[PDB]
Every structure is written in C-alpha cells, then in structure tokens.
Design an enzyme around this catalytic site. Sequence first.
Site, short mmCIF file in Angstrom:
data_model
loop_
_atom_site.label_atom_id
_atom_site.label_comp_id
_atom_site.label_asym_id
_atom_site.label_seq_id
_atom_site.Cartn_x
_atom_site.Cartn_y
_atom_site.Cartn_z
N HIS A 88 -58.47 47.96 -34.46
CA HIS A 88 -59.00 46.71 -33.61
C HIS A 88 -59.25 47.51 -32.30
O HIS A 88 -59.84 46.68 -31.37
CB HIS A 88 -58.31 45.53 -33.60
CG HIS A 88 -56.94 45.54 -32.67
ND1 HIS A 88 -55.73 45.25 -33.31
CD2 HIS A 88 -56.81 45.68 -31.43
CE1 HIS A 88 -54.87 45.23 -32.26
NE2 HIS A 88 -55.43 45.28 -31.11
N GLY A 114 -48.41 44.04 -25.28
CA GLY A 114 -49.16 44.95 -24.62
C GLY A 114 -48.90 46.57 -25.16
O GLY A 114 -49.42 47.41 -24.58
N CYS A 123 -49.68 47.66 -28.23
CA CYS A 123 -50.37 47.86 -29.31
C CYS A 123 -50.48 49.26 -29.99
O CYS A 123 -50.82 50.11 -29.02
CB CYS A 123 -51.85 47.20 -29.13
SG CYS A 123 -52.79 47.03 -30.75
#
Lengths: 301, 302
Positions: free
Chosen positions: B41, B143, B145
């Site tokens: 993503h 935050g 990821c």
Amino acid sequence: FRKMAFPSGKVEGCMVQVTCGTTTLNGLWLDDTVYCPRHVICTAEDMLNPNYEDLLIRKSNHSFLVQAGNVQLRVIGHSMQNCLLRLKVDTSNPKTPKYKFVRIQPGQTFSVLACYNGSPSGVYQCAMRPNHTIKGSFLNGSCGSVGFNIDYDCVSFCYMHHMELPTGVHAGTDLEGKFYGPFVDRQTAQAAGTDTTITLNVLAWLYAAVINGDRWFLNRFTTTLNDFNLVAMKYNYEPLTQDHVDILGPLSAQTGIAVLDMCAALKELLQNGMNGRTILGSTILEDEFTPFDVVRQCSGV
Amino acid sequence: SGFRKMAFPSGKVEGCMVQVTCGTTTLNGLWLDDTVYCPRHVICTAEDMLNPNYEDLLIRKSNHSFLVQAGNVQLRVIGHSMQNCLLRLKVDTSNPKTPKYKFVRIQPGQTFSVLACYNGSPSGVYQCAMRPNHTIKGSFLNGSCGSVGFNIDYDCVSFCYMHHMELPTGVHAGTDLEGKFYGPFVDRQTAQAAGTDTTITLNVLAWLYAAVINGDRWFLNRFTTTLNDFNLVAMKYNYEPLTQDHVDILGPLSAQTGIAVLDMCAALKELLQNGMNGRTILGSTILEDEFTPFDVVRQCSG
C-alpha cells in the site's frame, strides 16, 4: 500504552565475556577498554570479606580471558576504578557507538540488555526504584549486564549489574563503578529498604492518559502541594517536591493542566480508587514511565 | 530473579531497516540481501486506500517510482514485484548486515518482538502476542507501517510479522513475510470488524508456573479437575478452550515445579471464580497472558 525498550543494537555490539579463574560474567567493550564488575576476580568465598586491592595484586593480564564472539581479545593492562575492573585490550571495538557515562537519579528509567556470558539475551525497560534497587530479571550469568538510554545517536550508559538482593531485587553501579544505594560488592546482611511509588512518574502517566484522550479522572479542583503530600504519603507515595512540579512543566503546558490540578485528580483516585474504570487500559496507576518517556513516546519525533 | 516482559535484542533487525517512498507516501521496508520488502500500500495515496486495485496501481509504476533509503543514502531499485500484500524491490546493492534469517507464519497465541520504526529509523522495541483474533495490541504500531515482528533462535532471525493497518476500533493488523494477512483483514481503509477476542489460556497457565518457580504459590489449592470441567468454567470467562495438545506443551514446566497441569488448571478455575482478592502474582493484579510456555522456560531457566 506499552513500555518500550530502546533499540539494543548499539549496546549489543559492545558486550563481551570476561573470565577470571572459575568466574565468568559480562563486560562492556568501548574503544580499547573492557569494563566489568570487579568481583569477577572474587570466588564466592572471597565475597565474605574481599580485599580487592590485595586480590587484584595477585592477578596478571593473563589472569583475564576476554571473548568477543569467537575472538579472544588480548588483555594488555588492568586496574580498578571503585567497584569496576578496567581491562585494556589490544583492539579498539570497531562497533563502539558514540556514548556517555551518566549517573541516573532514583525514579528515572532505562533499558537493560540482559546477557549471558557475553551473549545478548533480551531487552526490557525498568526504573531505578526510590529505594535504589531495580526489579529485573537476571538469571545465572547476567552480572555485568548494563542499563542505558539512547538520545539521537548517543548511548548514555547508566547502570551495570553486580548483585541479587535477598528480595530477588537487584543492585549495581553507574559506569564509574559507584553503587546506587548503600549497597556493597560483598556478601553481607544488606537488604533493600521499604520502597515507595514514584509520584512524579504516576503524574507523568496521567498526563500521558490525557494526551491520549483518556481523561475521565480530571476534576474541577486543585490542591496545595503540602495537602497533596499529606494524602499521597499515606498511600506510600514519594513526597512530591517543587522540583518535581517544575519537571512536569512541559506536560502541564502541552495539556493546559496545572500540576497541582493534576495532583487533585490523583488525590481523588487514591482516596476513592478507580471504581472498576481503567486508565490507558490499566486498572492500576503506572509508575515506571518518566515525564521524558511520555514526551518521547507521545511526541515521537 | 524477577520476571519481566522481555523482547529479543533488536540489533540484527535494526541493521535491515530502510525507508521506502512512493509519490507522497513513506513507510518502512526490510532489506535482506538484495531485496527490500514493504507493504504494497506504499503505492497508494490515502484516497486510493478507500478501494484500491493493486494490479492497476502497480502496473502504473516503474523502478524509478520507488525511492529507497538506508539512512540518507539511496539504494537504486532495479526491479519490482508484488507477492500477496507485499511489494518486493530488488536493489543494486546487498545488505552486508543481513543476518541468518527465516520467514515464518505464527499461530495465534504466540509472542514475538516488534521493532517500532518511523521513516526507516528504529524507535523502540516491545514484546507482544498475536491475539486469538489475529490483531495485536499496541498504540505504538501507529505510523510504523512496515515495522516487523520477529523471534531469534541463536543467530537466526525468524521474521513473522509486518505491520500494515491501524484497525478503526483499535489494534493493528498485518501480514507474515509472504504478504499474507493474519486474520480476516484486508489491505483497504474500511471498517473491518475484529473478531471476538479471548484470553490465551495456555499462556496464563505458563505464567502461573512462572510464579511458582519464582516462589509465588498462594493461589494453589488441593483440588484437581478434568480438562472437560476446566473448560466449562474457563469458557464462561472468555478464555480460549484448553486442549490436550496445550496440556502436553505444559509438561516440562509441570515436571519442573512438580505441579500437575490439571492441578494448575484447578488453581486457575478458582482464580477465575474468586478473583485475586487484592493479592498479586509476579507483581501483577491481573492474570497475564502474553508469555508462552517457551517464554517462561527461557526466562526462568536459561
């Protein structure tokens, strides 16, 4: 809201195994020096009443075997500094990080890299208790493990482990070999005195709660510092000093909640409890997060 | 002595973290040998995340579309591909700090360490357990990821998790290092119900054994119980059903301590029925379920 440890890599690259006779423990290798508990030269019996200067005299450089991974580091010099043994080796640690040696104050936190015979085993966060001991986990062969804080790229070493206390609690020194607390490196009847809850940290943690939106415990009242201590000390909390109020200043400003107003909320929580409610998911008031840990973890950057 | 939630030393993983940026999106990547792994993503704007078609989005990118950095140094991407929910980026240089490693998929209930990172820089390490409902608890995954979870056996790092999503309703979701999500979650910014969660019975029993090897013992009693009867009680308190396989796992700890698994189950049953009455165990006021039997044996023996 998890207690986190600092990334341990920079310290991992500094751990080695030191052996003197039948005794083996961990050492910290920074540049060309290896630091470890001086009692590495002591046998159990020597611990009864050691004459360290005398014991160190009968030792030669060859008396110490230092192992860094699969490498034997040649010792070319040794000496004592308070309760630490300093061994000069012929190779400066290529992994030496930028560092400082600091003496921490009671209540402050740090990360501990638990090691076993020079090999890093696990890392956990903990706090120096008001009674100068740490509640940790040190199995057979962890003496010499160190505690530390990292700021940017700099490792501030603040603790080295030396003894287990009758309570299963631990005692040790700063990196200058000076014990925290009245403790000594020898077998005596010494024991940890009664401990208290670290009020400064509980307040920090309540600010953390508010910062994270958990604020049901706030109220519309305030309290005198002395009136707060009068109540809190009854619940075995450390007296809060004016210096502590100032230390909470940044958190107070960020949240717009004066410290004495947060103290009024804490007083009510101690006198009336939580009533099944929780704070930051906890049913208990946390005391091992400092104001700096909160800022660090809630302001991330 | 003492008993603490302990994480594995994180250095071996620190030496593999990098930053991966695409367009205006940045997150962490794991760099092993000549490959960098990150959440696919990374190719999505926040808007794309509403209903992305990864094929479509990816075909629109090139190697030049990816900026990977180790510290302040760019690593040139010479190839890319998608593997389930992971983006795999081949770079022109190899990571000499790559440790001996393995990619493993863990089962709910197991624990691992997570190296929380931001923009490819190591921030902190913590120990956690994969919940029975496949989420993981930790406001600290926010935050981060691309931050990964792992366990270390000797010198080998077993990577088991990569953080992908913040679950509207708390907890975070992620995948294994093959890109397969744990749980019924997807790579998309929509409300996704996290199944009911349960307490990890196997772990609570391991923790009580820990308390015993550490000298706590007030919670024991003179009874025993059948596995069946234990479950009839525990399942009323939202505890995971206990199986014979779970009891066998507790054998070593049972052998140490000399307390039969079912007798320990009998102690637990009472604890659930009569609370802890202000008393504590291993310093805690609640039954702890994030230490597996293996964790306990590791921290209590050597």
